[PDB]
Amino acid sequence: KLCLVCSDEASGCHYGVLTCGSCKVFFKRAVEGQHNYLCAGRNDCIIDKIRRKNCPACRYRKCLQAGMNLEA
Protein backbone atom coordinates (compact mmCIF):
# COMPACT_ATOMS: atom_id res chain seq x y z
CA LYS A 1 0.00 0.00 0.00
CA LEU A 2 2.54 2.63 1.17
CA CYS A 3 5.90 4.18 0.21
CA LEU A 4 8.60 2.74 2.43
CA VAL A 5 10.32 6.15 2.58
CA CYS A 6 7.52 8.65 3.21
CA SER A 7 4.40 6.48 3.75
CA ASP A 8 2.62 8.27 0.90
CA GLU A 9 0.61 5.96 -1.37
CA ALA A 10 3.05 3.77 -3.31
CA SER A 11 2.98 3.44 -7.08
CA GLY A 12 5.09 0.29 -7.44
CA CYS A 13 8.51 -1.26 -6.88
CA HIS A 14 11.01 1.41 -7.98
CA TYR A 15 14.75 0.88 -7.87
CA GLY A 16 14.19 -2.27 -5.78
CA VAL A 17 11.85 -0.81 -3.18
CA LEU A 18 8.14 -0.12 -2.83
CA THR A 19 7.95 3.67 -3.17
CA CYS A 20 5.79 6.60 -4.26
CA GLY A 21 6.36 8.69 -7.39
CA SER A 22 8.15 11.68 -5.86
CA CYS A 23 10.48 9.44 -3.84
CA LYS A 24 11.46 7.62 -7.08
CA VAL A 25 12.41 10.77 -8.97
CA PHE A 26 14.08 12.27 -5.89
CA PHE A 27 16.26 9.19 -5.48
CA LYS A 28 17.27 9.16 -9.16
CA ARG A 29 18.14 12.83 -9.10
CA ALA A 30 20.13 12.39 -5.85
CA VAL A 31 22.29 9.48 -7.02
CA GLU A 32 22.95 10.96 -10.48
CA GLY A 33 23.77 14.32 -8.95
CA GLN A 34 26.93 15.51 -7.22
CA HIS A 35 24.75 15.60 -4.17
CA ASN A 36 25.99 15.89 -0.64
CA TYR A 37 23.01 16.95 1.39
CA LEU A 38 23.25 18.27 4.90
CA CYS A 39 20.64 17.89 7.68
CA ALA A 40 19.66 20.96 9.69
CA GLY A 41 18.77 18.81 12.69
CA ARG A 42 20.09 15.51 14.00
CA ASN A 43 20.10 13.13 11.00
CA ASP A 44 16.74 11.76 12.22
CA CYS A 45 14.11 13.98 10.55
CA ILE A 46 10.48 12.82 10.17
CA ILE A 47 10.00 11.90 6.54
CA ASP A 48 6.32 11.90 5.52
CA LYS A 49 4.19 13.32 2.72
CA ILE A 50 4.22 16.87 4.06
CA ARG A 51 7.73 17.00 5.52
CA ARG A 52 9.69 14.80 3.13
CA LYS A 53 10.82 17.79 1.12
CA ASN A 54 12.30 19.51 4.19
CA CYS A 55 15.35 17.28 4.48
CA PRO A 56 16.86 15.69 1.38
CA ALA A 57 19.68 14.34 3.58
CA CYS A 58 17.39 12.32 5.83
CA ARG A 59 15.16 11.39 2.86
CA TYR A 60 18.16 10.17 0.88
CA ARG A 61 19.47 8.22 3.89
CA LYS A 62 16.05 6.53 4.24
CA CYS A 63 16.16 5.65 0.52
CA LEU A 64 19.52 3.90 0.97
CA GLN A 65 18.57 2.12 4.19
CA ALA A 66 15.47 0.78 2.47
CA GLY A 67 17.81 -0.77 -0.09
CA MET A 68 17.15 1.47 -3.08
CA ASN A 69 19.57 1.11 -5.96
CA LEU A 70 19.48 1.98 -9.65
CA GLU A 71 19.40 -1.80 -10.29
CA ALA A 72 16.19 -3.73 -9.55
Place this chain on the structure above:
Amino acid sequence: PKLCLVCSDEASGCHYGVLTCGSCKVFFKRAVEGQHNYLCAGRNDCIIDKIRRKNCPACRYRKCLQAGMNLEARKTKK
Protein backbone atom coordinates in the same frame (compact mmCIF):
# COMPACT_ATOMS: atom_id res chain seq x y z
CA PRO B 1 31.73 42.30 8.51
CA LYS B 2 27.89 42.42 9.00
CA LEU B 3 25.80 39.19 8.81
CA CYS B 4 22.12 38.14 8.57
CA LEU B 5 20.95 37.59 12.17
CA VAL B 6 18.77 34.80 10.85
CA CYS B 7 20.91 32.85 8.36
CA SER B 8 24.42 34.40 8.69
CA ASP B 9 24.46 35.23 4.95
CA GLU B 10 25.83 38.66 4.18
CA ALA B 11 23.46 41.24 5.64
CA SER B 12 22.14 44.00 3.37
CA GLY B 13 20.74 46.29 6.07
CA CYS B 14 18.26 46.67 8.93
CA HIS B 15 15.04 45.13 7.59
CA TYR B 16 11.85 44.99 9.64
CA GLY B 17 13.91 46.12 12.60
CA VAL B 18 16.61 43.49 12.37
CA LEU B 19 19.98 42.99 10.65
CA THR B 20 19.22 40.57 7.82
CA CYS B 21 19.88 39.60 4.22
CA GLY B 22 17.74 40.16 1.14
CA SER B 23 16.43 36.61 1.14
CA CYS B 24 15.39 36.60 4.80
CA LYS B 25 13.75 40.04 4.34
CA VAL B 26 11.42 38.81 1.61
CA PHE B 27 11.02 35.36 3.16
CA PHE B 28 9.61 37.17 6.22
CA LYS B 29 7.42 39.52 4.18
CA ARG B 30 6.08 36.51 2.27
CA ALA B 31 5.50 34.52 5.46
CA VAL B 32 3.57 37.27 7.31
CA GLU B 33 1.31 38.40 4.48
CA GLY B 34 0.44 34.79 3.60
CA GLN B 35 -0.42 31.81 5.81
CA HIS B 36 2.88 30.43 7.38
CA ASN B 37 1.46 27.06 8.50
CA TYR B 38 4.86 25.31 8.17
CA LEU B 39 5.77 22.02 9.82
CA CYS B 40 9.21 21.17 11.26
CA ALA B 41 10.61 17.74 10.48
CA GLY B 42 13.01 17.83 13.42
CA ARG B 43 12.50 19.33 16.88
CA ASN B 44 11.88 23.00 16.12
CA ASP B 45 15.50 23.99 16.55
CA CYS B 46 16.88 23.37 13.07
CA ILE B 47 20.18 25.11 12.17
CA ILE B 48 19.46 28.07 9.88
CA ASP B 49 22.30 29.04 7.51
CA LYS B 50 22.73 29.94 3.90
CA ILE B 51 22.76 26.39 2.57
CA ARG B 52 20.13 25.05 4.98
CA ARG B 53 17.69 27.97 5.45
CA LYS B 54 15.57 26.42 2.70
CA ASN B 55 15.15 23.16 4.65
CA CYS B 56 12.89 24.40 7.41
CA PRO B 57 10.59 27.37 6.74
CA ALA B 58 9.11 26.74 10.23
CA CYS B 59 12.34 27.27 12.13
CA ARG B 60 13.43 30.06 9.80
CA TYR B 61 10.17 31.93 10.49
CA ARG B 62 10.63 31.19 14.17
CA LYS B 63 14.12 32.69 14.14
CA CYS B 64 12.71 35.78 12.38
CA LEU B 65 10.06 36.29 15.08
CA GLN B 66 12.52 35.49 17.85
CA ALA B 67 14.92 38.11 16.44
CA GLY B 68 12.12 40.72 16.70
CA MET B 69 11.24 41.18 13.06
CA ASN B 70 8.01 43.05 12.42
CA LEU B 71 6.52 44.87 9.42
CA GLU B 72 5.72 48.00 11.40
CA ALA B 73 9.34 48.51 12.58
CA ARG B 74 10.59 51.29 10.23
CA LYS B 75 7.34 53.21 10.83
CA THR B 76 8.70 54.15 14.32
CA LYS B 77 10.84 56.56 13.85
CA LYS B 78 8.78 58.37 16.56
Place this chain on the structure above:
DNA sequence: AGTGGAAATTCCCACT
Protein backbone atom coordinates in the same frame (compact mmCIF):
# COMPACT_ATOMS: atom_id res chain seq x y z
C1' DA C 1 24.02 60.54 -1.34
C1' DG C 2 22.08 56.77 1.61
C1' DT C 3 18.44 53.98 3.79
C1' DG C 4 14.87 50.58 3.68
C1' DG C 5 10.01 49.72 1.86
C1' DA C 6 7.51 46.91 -1.79
C1' DA C 7 7.15 45.17 -6.54
C1' DA C 8 8.96 42.76 -10.27
C1' DT C 9 11.70 39.61 -12.40
C1' DT C 10 14.35 35.72 -12.50
C1' DC C 11 15.83 31.37 -10.71
C1' DC C 12 15.00 27.00 -8.59
C1' DC C 13 12.36 22.96 -7.54
C1' DA C 14 8.14 19.59 -6.65
C1' DC C 15 5.34 16.81 -8.04
C1' DT C 16 1.91 15.65 -12.49
Place this chain on the structure above:
DNA sequence: AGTGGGAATTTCCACT
Protein backbone atom coordinates in the same frame (compact mmCIF):
# COMPACT_ATOMS: atom_id res chain seq x y z
C1' DA D 1 6.09 17.94 -19.23
C1' DG D 2 3.77 22.34 -18.25
C1' DT D 3 1.55 24.59 -14.51
C1' DG D 4 2.26 26.42 -10.20
C1' DG D 5 4.65 27.90 -6.31
C1' DG D 6 8.70 29.17 -3.31
C1' DA D 7 13.07 31.29 -3.07
C1' DA D 8 16.20 34.98 -4.11
C1' DT D 9 17.95 38.80 -6.72
C1' DT D 10 17.10 43.07 -8.93
C1' DT D 11 14.74 47.18 -9.39
C1' DC D 12 12.41 51.45 -8.43
C1' DC D 13 9.82 53.86 -4.89
C1' DA D 14 9.60 57.59 -0.92
C1' DC D 15 12.24 60.10 2.22
C1' DT D 16 16.77 61.87 4.36
